[PDB]
Design a protein around this ligand. Structure first.
Ligand code: NA
Ligand code: NA
Lengths: 138, 6, 137
C-alpha cells in the first residue's frame, strides 16, 4: 500500500468468516472446521471470533445433523461496518487541525464499510469469479 | 486496532 | 472508536511537524527544538523524521544564523497524502471479495488525503481557532 494501510487479522478473518457464512446461507448450517478449511484460517482463532459474533447476534448455532453455524440475519441486513463495529472495542483545549484530518479519514472509511453489505459481496463474488463464452467479454 | 495507517 | 482506525506515530508526527512548518513558512526558518516544543514531540524522533522529509525534498535546511528548517515547497503544493507516501515503505489465483473491500477502503483514504493540502490545513486552522464578536456566530 502507498498510504500504508494495514488491516488487522481480526478484521480480515471476521469478514472472511462472515462472507463464507453468507455464501452458504441458503444451503444451511456449516461447521467451523469447514469455514477454516475453505478460508485458510486457524480453527482456534475462528472459534474465538465466532463466539463474539454469536453474542452480537450476527451468527447463530444450530443443533442439527448438519448442525453448525449460520448467519443470524440475512446478508442484505449485515453491513461490513456492522461486523467491524462488533469486533472493535492540568486540562486544556487546543484544537488540532491534524487530528481533524484523521477524523475525515475515519469518516470516509466508515462510509465505505457501511455502503457494502454481505449481499453486495455475494453479488460481486458471482460476477468476478464466473466463466462465460469469450465473445461476451466486452 | 482494526486498521492502521501507515 | 467505531471502526477502530489507529494512526501511526509516524503519520501523526510527520503531519504535525509539516503543518508546524507550514504555519511558519512566511516568517522563515525555525529550529527543530521549537517544533518539538510547540507540538509536544520528542526531539530525537523528530530529527529522524525530518531527515527523511529532507531527503524527499519536502523540507530544507538553511544555514542562516537564526536558521533552521523550512518547507521546500509551498503549502498549496504539498498534499497530506504526499507526506504519508514519503514516510511509508505452489502458486494459484483465487479472487478474494474480502480483499476487494479493503482495496475500496484504501482508495477512499487515498482520496481524502490527496484532497487536503497544507494550505487547506492553514485555512482551516485560521477559521476554527478564531475569536470574534459573539453576534457574528
Ligand atoms: Na465492539
Ligand atoms: Na516512502
Amino acid at each position: 500500500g502507498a498510504m500504508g494501510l494495514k488491516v488487522s487479522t481480526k478484521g480480515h478473518y471476521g469478514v472472511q468468516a462472515m462472507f463464507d457464512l453468507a455464501q452458504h446461507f441458503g444451503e444451511g448450517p456449516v461447521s467451523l472446521k469447514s469455514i477454516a478449511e475453505r478460508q485458510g484460517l486457524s480453527e482456534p482463532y475462528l472459534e474465538q471470533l465466532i463466539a463474539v459474533l454469536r453474542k452480537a447476534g450476527l451468527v447463530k448455532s444450530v443443533r442439527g445433523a448438519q448442525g453448525g453455524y449460520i448467519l443470524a440475519r440475512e446478508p442484505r441486513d449485515i453491513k461490513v461496518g456492522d461486523i467491524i463495529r462488533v469486533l472493535e472495542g492540568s486540562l486544556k483545549f487546543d484544537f488540532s487541525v491534524t487530528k481533524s484530518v484523521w477524523e475525515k479519514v475515519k469518516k470516509s472509511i466508515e462510509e465505505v464499510l457501511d455502503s457494502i453489505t454481505l449481499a453486495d459481496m455475494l453479488k460481486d463474488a458471482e460476477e468476478a469469479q464466473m466463466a462465460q463464452g469469450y465473445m461476451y467479454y466486452i | 486496532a482494526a486498521a492502521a495507517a501507515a
